[PDB]
Design a protein around this motif. Structure first.
Motif, PDB file in Angstrom:
ATOM      1  N   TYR A 136       0.826  -1.202   0.000  1.00 57.05           N
ATOM      2  CA  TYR A 136       0.000   0.000   0.000  1.00 57.05           C
ATOM      3  C   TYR A 136       0.861   1.254   0.000  1.00 57.05           C
ATOM      4  N   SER A 137       1.962   1.231   0.752  1.00 59.04           N
ATOM      5  CA  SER A 137       2.870   2.371   0.772  1.00 59.04           C
ATOM      6  C   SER A 137       3.472   2.611  -0.605  1.00 59.04           C
ATOM      7  N   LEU A 138       3.877   1.542  -1.289  1.00 53.12           N
ATOM      8  CA  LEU A 138       4.406   1.691  -2.641  1.00 53.12           C
ATOM      9  C   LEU A 138       3.346   2.240  -3.586  1.00 53.12           C
ATOM     10  N   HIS A 197       3.512   5.766  -5.674  1.00 50.53           N
ATOM     11  CA  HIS A 197       3.384   5.879  -7.119  1.00 50.53           C
ATOM     12  C   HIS A 197       1.963   6.201  -7.560  1.00 50.53           C
ATOM     13  N   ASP A 198       1.112   6.653  -6.638  1.00 53.84           N
ATOM     14  CA  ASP A 198      -0.233   7.126  -6.964  1.00 53.84           C
ATOM     15  C   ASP A 198      -1.029   6.076  -7.734  1.00 53.84           C
ATOM     16  N   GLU A 247       9.894  -9.178  -2.641  1.00 57.27           N
ATOM     17  CA  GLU A 247      11.101  -9.326  -3.448  1.00 57.27           C
ATOM     18  C   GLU A 247      11.133  -8.305  -4.582  1.00 57.27           C
ATOM     19  N   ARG A 248      10.047  -8.215  -5.358  1.00 58.80           N
ATOM     20  CA  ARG A 248       9.993  -7.149  -6.363  1.00 58.80           C
ATOM     21  C   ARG A 248      10.013  -5.754  -5.747  1.00 58.80           C
ATOM     22  N   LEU A 249       9.529  -5.589  -4.518  1.00 52.49           N
ATOM     23  CA  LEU A 249       9.612  -4.279  -3.881  1.00 52.49           C
ATOM     24  C   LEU A 249      11.064  -3.887  -3.635  1.00 52.49           C
ATOM     25  N   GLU A 278       6.117  -0.041 -12.927  1.00 53.32           N
ATOM     26  CA  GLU A 278       4.766   0.495 -13.034  1.00 53.32           C
ATOM     27  C   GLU A 278       3.772  -0.595 -13.408  1.00 53.32           C
ATOM     28  N   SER A 279       4.143  -1.464 -14.352  1.00 51.79           N
ATOM     29  CA  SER A 279       3.255  -2.555 -14.733  1.00 51.79           C
ATOM     30  C   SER A 279       3.013  -3.500 -13.565  1.00 51.79           C
ATOM     31  N   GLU A 280       4.068  -3.833 -12.820  1.00 52.01           N
ATOM     32  CA  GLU A 280       3.912  -4.721 -11.673  1.00 52.01           C
ATOM     33  C   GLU A 280       3.020  -4.095 -10.610  1.00 52.01           C
ATOM     34  N   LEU A 281       3.212  -2.804 -10.335  1.00 57.67           N
ATOM     35  CA  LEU A 281       2.379  -2.131  -9.345  1.00 57.67           C
ATOM     36  C   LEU A 281       0.922  -2.094  -9.786  1.00 57.67           C
ATOM     37  N   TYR A 282       0.676  -1.790 -11.063  1.00 58.93           N
ATOM     38  CA  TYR A 282      -0.695  -1.760 -11.560  1.00 58.93           C
ATOM     39  C   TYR A 282      -1.338  -3.137 -11.471  1.00 58.93           C
TER      40      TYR A 282
END
Lengths: 63, 159, 734
Positions: free
Chosen positions: C70-72, C76-77, C116-118, C253-257
């Motif tokens: 959630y923080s990430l 990144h909005d 891990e990706r974070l 960005e793709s991973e976060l989305y």
């Protein structure tokens, strides 16, 4: 948007006041202390109601 | 990971607990395989790599990095050239070949962070440039591995 | 058989036996049902001894990972598109009870992988920052060289010419665009810091001074061919780094989305699993024996539904293992559960905010739901104000689906929860205004006014009207602006408030009798109910009867002078009676007898209750408190009049200001002024009167309620029931 409700309420109140003045109820022009020009009171209240309705139309929004 | 998750779960039977302990003990075979730097080197020389725990030998121990350092980075350079040729072979589009290419990219990324000499050798051999060009791999896992390898190479390049 | 709001609420104790293997499924089914409160039998031990303590720690780690995600997303909005899906999951859980699933370990591993990706994305950000630092060196273009923000170039030059007092040339060159700084976190215009001098020690001193001057030095070669080659190499490296950074940013960005597509759902599932584990830890269990055996709280009405749901779960279970519950007797106090309908939940919450009722059957606190709107109205008064606030409540009630969809709000949440209390308050206020002939300090005179002034009113002299009959309802339509009107209305709502308050007190007292009668408490009834009734009746009910009588008898036509109600009370209190006038010849003697009975009732409070004591001091204190509180509260209820008159006078003053601002001379400019005057009056009335007066008056009516009504019958604290259902929040990560 928000002001539309206020304008509508003002128009309704002024219309009721004009109706009372035309009917010359005990209140308003009925009181001797208040001016007795009942037709003038009705005219003023009717024009105020017209102005309030114009404000309502102006505040009206579609989306 | 499944054995670890099962061991994390509660056991409702004493026999089940004994079986879980036995499975945990048997899991030491994976650790033994990972520490076998000779096995990892043979698999790299072998035409196929299955991304086994030996594929993390460099992370598991510095022995793999020391072995790959041999012949002035040539132990790693040979594997890098083999991976580059396999990429240029045109068979990497296959799903199993895609997994093999992902394992190779992960190994290259580990090697790059292992020692800057490997990065210099890859740049001299042209393998680093080829990997950077092919970083836009079709497979998502392959793409991520190639991006990690490029970041490792770029990070040492600017350092 | 289900029970509604009638008497001290219903609950029951039941023990649920379940197989060990189906423990998680049964817990999920119960949480989806949310109709039980498991007794914390296993929670007597410390938290470190919880059966699922390790599972609790794993769930906590998963929650920490979700918080990091959630923080990430915030950093990144991310849109958190799964928030819309989380609402369906809460709706799905409330309606159909979807299975929780046993893949909790899979989500735990997925959370570790996401971490891990974070870490990978954090490393990518660090590399991007390093490249941005490297890009600064690329600004070098055709001795010590460096780059410095333009704000300090003059200071650096002065320091150089002072410390290195000798001659040292400078080659300041301006940078076209600002470059971001690490500590400053800002991009500032920079300039080249190329400088040449002789002496190795001088060069070292210059480098040290520049470093102290917040400079980043560069080793660009002076040779034109060498500088060109170095610049080409730096440009190639910068292009490669830019491509790598762009690819890394796109991947992150793709991973976060992608994570945001199910981040809210995963968080809700993790919260549900954590709640299930916490319930299991509080629930009784054994290691060697069949796990998931415990007891709890459940209503009798829900037993059949619980059995049916358990049977459905067993059918859905992978093993045919029966699952039922057992009802057992226990002297430990049960909880209390109020059956909250959609339009009475607010009333129940308002009533129980004071405390927790005693146990019995049905549900309690019901009369508040009707009385609070009416008592708020009796002091709200205005027909127009009540109608307006009723309309506002209707607007806030018709959109309940949207209201639930919308954010609760800081204050609106209380208002939204009161979307039905406010509506009843508005209806009651509209009725009271249909009585109080004041729309906004205006008697519309719908009916026929029963009063008539003399035939020829004087040209400018006051006169006193005469009446032939009473008004059909509400105040007589002639009382508008009358000099007497204030005093007459005061004498009216004196008896109005007194009678309404005594009615409320006596009805609450009736409730008290009902609560005593539900129990046996024969000594309690004899020592508390009857003598308190004797007090309040034989004093204040007699006063109310006298108030009614003075209205019944036409003292004008009968000629007998009207005795003073306060005078009658004073005569009763400190005299054998014989007031200047009396309601009836026996009424003086009757009042004397009633006062004597009230006086004799004090020892009944003092000593009839114990009937066996050291604890009798508490009984004596309670008796003194009961007498004093009855006197004080029945005296208080005139505070309803206080609020009512305040509202009426405020409305009159506001309308006077509005009329003075608006009417004026009724000209065109007068009409222009009135156009704004009416809106100003409406705004002032709305804000001050409605928003404040009404909220305050609701508080006043509720205060009178807790002070008198519930003080008559509320028996004391108790155990509040818990539904133990999953929160389904999926928000407020803080």
């Amino acid at each position: 948007w928000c002001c539309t409700v206020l304008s509508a309420f003002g128009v309704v109140i002024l219309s009721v006041i004009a109706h009372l003045f035309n009917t010359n109820h005990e209140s308003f022009v009925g009181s001797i202390n208040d001016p007795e020009d009942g037709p003038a009171v009705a005219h003023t209240v009717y024009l105020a109601a017209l102005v309030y309705l114009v404000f309502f139309v102006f505040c009206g929004f579609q989306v | 990971p499944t054995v670890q998750s099962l061991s994390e779960r509660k056991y409702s039977d004493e026999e089940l607990r004994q079986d879980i302990s036995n499975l945990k003990e048997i899991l030491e075979n994976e650790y033994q395989e990972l520490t076998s730097f000779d096995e990892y080197v043979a698999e790299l020389d072998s035409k196929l790599l299955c991304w086994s725990p030996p594929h993390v030998d460099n992370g598991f121990w510095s022995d793999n990095i020391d072995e790959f350092k041999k012949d002035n980075y040539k132990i790693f350079r040979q594997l890098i050239e083999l991976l580059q040729a396999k990429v240029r072979n045109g068979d990497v589009n296959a799903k199993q070949e895609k997994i093999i290419i992902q394992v190779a990219l992960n190994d290259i990324t580990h090697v790059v962070e292992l020692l800057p000499e490997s990065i210099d050798v890859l740049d001299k051999t042209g393998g680093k440039a080829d990997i950077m060009e092919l970083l836009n791999h079709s497979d998502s896992r392959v793409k991520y591995e190639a991006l990690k390898a490029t970041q490792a190479i770029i990070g040492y390049t600017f350092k | 058989k289900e029970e509604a709001i009638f008497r001290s609420a219903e609950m029951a104790l039941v023990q649920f036996y379940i197989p060990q293997e189906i423990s998680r499924d049964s817990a999920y089914t119960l949480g989806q049902l949310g109709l039980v409160q498991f007794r914390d039998l296993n929670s007597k031990v410390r938290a470190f001894q919880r059966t699922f303590v390790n599972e609790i720690r794993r769930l906590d780690n998963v929650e920490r990972q979700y918080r990091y995600f959630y923080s990430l997303l915030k950093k990144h909005d991310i849109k958190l598109y799964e928030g819309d899906t989380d609402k369906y999951l809460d709706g799905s859980g409330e309606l159909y009870v979807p299975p929780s699933g046993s893949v909790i370990d899979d989500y735990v591993r997925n959370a570790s992988y996401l971490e891990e990706r974070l870490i990978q994305m954090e490393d990518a950000t660090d590399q991007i920052e390093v490249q941005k630092n490297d890009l600064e060196q690329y600004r070098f273009i055709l001795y010590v060289t460096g780059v410095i923000a333009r704000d300090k170039v003059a200071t650096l030059e002065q320091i150089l010419w002072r410390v290195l007092r000798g001659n040292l040339f400078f080659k300041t060159v301006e940078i076209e665009q600002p470059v971001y700084d690490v500590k400053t976190r800002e991009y500032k215009h920079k300039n080249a810091f190329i400088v040449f001098s002789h002496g190795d020690l001088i060069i070292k001193r210059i480098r040290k001074i520049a470093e102290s001057l917040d400079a980043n030095l560069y080793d660009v070669d002076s040779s034109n061919e060498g500088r060109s080659q170095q610049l080409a190499k730096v440009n190639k490296n910068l292009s490669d780094l830019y491509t790598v950074l762009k690819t890394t940013s796109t991947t992150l960005e793709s991973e976060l989305y992608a994570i945001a597509k199910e981040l809210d759902s995963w968080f809700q599932d993790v919260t549900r699993e954590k709640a299930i584990f916490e319930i299991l830890n509080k629930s009784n269990y054994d290691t060697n024996r069949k796990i998931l055996i415990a007891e709890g709280w459940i209503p009798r009405d829900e037993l059949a539904t619980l059995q049916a749901r358990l049977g459905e779960m067993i059918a859905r279970l992978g093993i045919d293992v029966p699952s039922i519950i057992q009802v057992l007797d226990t002297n430990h106090t049960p909880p209390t559960f109020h059956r909250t309908n959609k339009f009475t939940a607010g009333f129940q919450s308002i009533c129980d905010c004071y405390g927790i009722a005693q146990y019995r059957e049905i549900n309690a606190g019901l009369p508040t739901i009707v009385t609070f709107p009416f008592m708020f109205a009796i002091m709200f008064g205005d027909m127009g104000h009540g109608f307006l606030m009723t309309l506002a409540a209707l607007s806030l009630v018709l959109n309940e689906k949207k209201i639930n969809k919308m954010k609760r709000g800081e204050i609106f949440d209380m208002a939204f929860t009161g979307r039905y209390i406010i509506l009843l308050m508005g209806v009651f206020s509209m009725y009271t205004g249909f009585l109080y002939n004041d729309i906004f300090s205006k008697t519309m005179t719908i009916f026929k006014s029963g009063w008539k002034w003399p035939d020829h009113w004087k040209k400018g002299e006051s006169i006193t009207a005469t009446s032939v009959g009473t008004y059909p309802i509400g105040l007589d339509w002639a009382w508008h602006g009358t000099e007497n009107a204030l005093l007459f209305s005061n004498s009216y709502k004196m008896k109005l408030s007194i009678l309404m308050g005594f009615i409320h007190m006596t009805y609450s007292y009736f409730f008290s009798l009902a609560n005593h009668l539900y129990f046996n408490s024969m000594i309690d009834i004899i020592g508390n109910f009857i003598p308190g009734l004797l007090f309040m009746q034989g004093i204040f009910g007699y006063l109310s009867v006298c108030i009614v009588y003075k209205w019944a008898v036409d003292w004008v036509k009968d000629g007998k002078p009207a005795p003073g109600l306060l005078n009658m009370l004073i005569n009763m209190f400190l005299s054998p009676g014989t007031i200047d006038d009396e309601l009836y010849p026996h009424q003086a003697k009757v009042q004397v007898f009633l006062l004597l009975m009230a006086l004799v009732c004090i020892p009944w409070l003092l000593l009839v209750k114990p009937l066996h004591g050291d604890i009798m001091i508490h009984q004596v204190i309670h008796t003194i408190e009961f007498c004093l509180n009855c006197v004080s509260h029945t005296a208080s209820y005139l505070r309803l009049w206080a609020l009512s008159l305040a509202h009426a006078q405020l409305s009159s003053v506001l309308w006077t200001m509005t009329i003075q601002i608006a009417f004026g001379f009724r000209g065109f400019v007068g009409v222009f002024m009135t156009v704004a005057l009416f809106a100003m009056w409406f705004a002032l009335t709305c804000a001050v009167l409605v928003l404040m007066e009404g909220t305050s008056a609701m508080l006043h009516s509720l205060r009178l309620h807790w002070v008198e009504s519930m003080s008559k019958f509320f028996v004391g604290e108790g155990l509040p029931y818990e539904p133990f259902a999953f929160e389904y929040k999926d928000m407020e990560v803080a």
